[model samples]
Target: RDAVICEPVRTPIGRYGGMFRSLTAVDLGVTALKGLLERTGIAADQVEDVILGHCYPNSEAPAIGRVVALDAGLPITVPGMQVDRRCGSGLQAVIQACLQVRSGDHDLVVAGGAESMSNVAFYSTDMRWGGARTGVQIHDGLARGRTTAGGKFHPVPGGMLETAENLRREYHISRTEQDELAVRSHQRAVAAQSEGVLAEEIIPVPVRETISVDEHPRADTTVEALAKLKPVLLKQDPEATVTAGNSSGQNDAASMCIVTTPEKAAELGLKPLVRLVSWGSAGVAPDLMGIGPVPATEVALAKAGLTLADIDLIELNEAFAAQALAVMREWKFGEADHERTNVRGSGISLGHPVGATGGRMLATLARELHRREARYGLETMCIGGGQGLAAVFERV
Candidate 1:
């Protein structure tokens, strides 16, 4: 039996330290899962498993998937697990569920991703044992995670920001062009919001009150405003071009979808949004992590017996304008490609909540494919630890 994605939903991504600052990753995950179950009218007891992606896991939320499952009121019989592949975690969770469903290992599964960048804690590595005689050094999780994301094998001194600069210099992507892309991203996102294109996939998040709309994308963003900003990695390299204006911001969100066989979907009266065709993942040098999508997409397209031209829509995660442009250049995409790519905006405008980004992309991609009556849609993103994940979806 082939697996199909159904009833995809996500919380409107909140800016770091914004409206969702009080909520933990588990809190958001539960909201998204409950929304999925409510929207699909699927009984909690019928679910065989729940899988969630979470990049930053702490002792308080060990095995976060299980925590979210229980909190969301899933039956005790349903098992839950967590997965981490950096930015690809959310997409990977869904794909892993697809594999199980296709293998006849499970008939119904809930796959999702959640992240609370605003609440990522600061910690002292030395506090585990006896107290240090000297002052203990506290590390910022958001910063430390990226710097050490590739492990000891490859050191990324400036974190993902440095990799964006590396790609900018290597690709010869001008600051003006990068800024232009940022402006475009904001424009598209704002337009989508006003036009109600994004509402379909969003689940209202309750903070002090109910929050439904995304808080990032600016309606007044301009190239001139972006030009005034300095590079985030300016201390590392004076000639750096990557800035907060062009790079994705730390975000908070949760996204979920049901993965099950077509037979099961039909039996449950669930409408299939898209059917999985093929997926691929690839690794690259940590310093040039932005280009991971090219190789991974190549692998996926080949396995699907299709070419880039056959893909009607594309959602390439915009980690940074330079990074996305570099990958687009490799694909030889021209001005025409811009229309179908990130039609509703991506990381720059929508905010990249690390683990939740893939599911958010899937929500937009699947719905947009249906809106356009397109056949195949491509969803891909560059991972923090020098990897890329890509998947092809055919509209159902």
Candidate 2:
């Protein structure tokens, strides 16, 4: 009773502090949905429901999913709900949509993820300044703390880079390994673009006056260049070495897919690209978050009755290069195993639009498998707080 996940498409990734600051999360999601509906010949009214994943959503639009649905011209009757699993939210949306299809509750579902890092706003607690009128303050998207009462706070350990540092200290990972991955990821992304390996999965938007392909790969990036960058997470700990070059950038993008039962796809005359084989999410220590994928991947693979060697393609989100290395190394994977990891490129080079990244991985993996005619693919990512998620796909 499994379902089909089809036509996974991604909007061109907008670089952090770069292009696309003008767009909102809902705009990106709508753009992706419009493109998807056009390609699949499924009108907006035909979609039974839409599920969107968003992290750091805009305060103005509390229901990003509903906003995205209506603005995309979906009928008022279509229901939409938003999912927030932080970094894993996008893939989580797809997973849930597939479940609905499998249960026969839905004939077709539009599942997507979107984020606008550029639009993440800063805030303050007016506390004493606004008097008893308006101010009580705590600041941070990735920050955590406990109040000792008089407004001063005791900080809690959390954050993307902090998690990378946790893995670095715990696993004894080397700086050289991370730097090499930075260079390799950008180089691979550059090569893949040149070869047009990603053309299909990427739905190009003509322009907010000017359009760009996902061609922001670094020509000057090298192990040497990376070595010169300073540690961003923990400046004092010499070995606490996650850097801007090795970590994913803030980005804006949207990714989506069509989900339906096999019978539904056949009835609609659609070619199913991949079968949603299995998915799993797991939690780990809040501090040592990167290793969550190791357990999550195992869960997904075990459910599918498959193993690492049987997976031909793997998209492990590059939240941080060190996190990437730790996950692979913990799997007991060495250099040879990396060939299957992030094969076309990854977040380190392409950009990571938080909630959108997991969905982006699905599109990238689905297209990579079809291009190579591979049988199985898996996409996984480490969550911001203390979790990881993985999903398995079988080419149809």
Candidate 3:
């Protein structure tokens, strides 16, 4: 009972407060899901369930997947749920759907991720009860979530950037190396955009007008330009090397795919892209969150009875250059290995919409594997709360 993926699609990612600011997470999710259904020719009533990852869900869409299903015109009989594992939420949603199908609990499911960071609400915990007179203590949902992501055991005051700096020092990653990686990311993404590689999987979003291109990749990015940027923690740590130019940006997007058994896919006349093989997750110290993917990938490789050498392509999310490089070092990747990793660019250029990143990566990874007729593919990313997640897919 192998769970197969079909018709993966995503809305073009929007920079924070860019083209998608007016659209809520539900809006993007609906657009992507509708596009997926149209492409797959799958009737709404055929879907057994919907599961979506949403990192900063507000009351505007409680059980965000349910609202997305209804908005996408799925029958009310369909059930849905939302999951949150910080940055891994999107991948987690797909994994959860695979489990249901593998366990014979469901036949067909819609799975993916959605996040509109621009729409994340700001509020105060004290407002529910009473007031604090003048200084009532308001909090920005984006910043507050970052600071609290580490949980009670480890608090990240400087947020994700602090974590990146920690990885930089531990791994001895230099500012020049990080800048070079970011420059490569931009160059590859710009090429992909110009070649229409990304357009193959993106669903055009109609916000007043059609928005078909991703808004984050910079066409003129260069190592020299990135080198001039000041480290985010310069004031607190003189040796810090992580800068905004080398880090991923906040973004808004939604990605979706159908998860079902091979038999069901054949029954529906669907074209399968990949079959789920094995997956893994691991936790690490919050301060060293960036390196979490290494252990997670090891576990997944072992479970799949394969190794990094056997995988034809990899999609490792670029939360920060230092963090990603540190993980690559663990895998003993050299300059030559860059050809097999993030070939179309990643978080640094494509943007990281917390909950949507995993699905986005899968969109590229599965499609790229099919294009190359590769046998195996891997997708892995570090989470915000000191954890890593990974999954293996074999081209169907």
Candidate 4:
């Protein structure tokens, strides 16, 4: 369901496309497709369709979903679609594929997401109308940016970091609260990695036998180290708290899963890893994008005929510790509950490849459910566009 996420290399040190600068998202997609077919013992021909969510794609590939399907040896007749919902793209792709399978439109489908953030190119206006060859450089993030993107812009004259600040400002979340959460995220990730909990979902790169595991996750970062960092939001305010250390970093990765009807899986003598229980998306005030998952998770759980206590395992994308903390307070999750829910290290520590995050979260969620012998798991994230997406999974 997943390949190892390349260690997130911040630009100026890591390659421009995060760690997968030398690779194409399409290549990653093909790898996952191959893994899916092999793991399920399903033939490529048996796949009737494929769908992929990718954000910040450069001009190198126009239709990556089709490319991956064809290159993975799927029949040309297998139709594929590319989906874009900013950070939610991958899970959106999964939802669409699931809908098709549920409607009995197709017997088998492959769905997921891919992203090579380092490969996101700057706009070359050298030859365009009224374009300048000099003194003008447009990074993709400066245009069509999501609230979570570092290149972020907005219709309301604010950006992603501001959204995290909105949490602190609106709810008076303290620096200690946010920073402590970040520390736990990293510490827990290290623990998970040591326990081999992360290895179950990670597939090594095609031939780089030496390349494995996520590049992020600091074993040495401490609250003091984080405290020394400067504020990113409301920099002029002495009370400002959001810092680079508490936010999700850029990355590159791909992930996917096979979707088929229960009848299909049964006929093939296969068991599904998780059942698609329910999904929901919600929107919030632009400045509060970081808290988007709160209402979205509520909607999803409500739709699933469940309650917060019904959840056995949970993975809420830690785009920023401030955001996660705000949501926890909103849900009234005690410190114990917060620790139990997000036991695995999250985006801020592992890296967030924008579009690929949802799929990666799902892959990790599956392994987590099995690790704890949990019956239900919920994976959710705050999108960059004032929205949140949540999906409930039932271990099968």
* Per-model TM against the reference: 0.98, 0.92, 0.98, 0.89
lDDT string, candidate 2, 321-370, tens digits:
88988888878887788888897788899998987888889988888888
Ranking by TM-score: 3, 1, 2, 4
Point out the higher-scoring one by lDDT: 1 or 2: 1
* Over 4 Å off, model 1: 133-135
Q: Name the lDDT of candidate 3.
A: 0.92
User: In terms of TM-score, how similar is model 4 to the real structure?
Assistant: 0.89
Q: CA lDDT of each candidate? A: 0.93, 0.82, 0.92, 0.74
Clashing pairs in 1: none
Predictions ranked by lDDT, top down?
1, 3, 2, 4
Candidate 4 colliding pairs: 7-215, 16-118, 17-118, 17-119, 18-118, 147-384
Name the lDDT of candidate 2. 0.82
lDDT of 4 at 379: 86
The runs of at least 3 residues in candidate 2 whose Cα sits more than 4 Å from the true structure, single-residue gaps closed, are 124-130, 133-158, 210-212
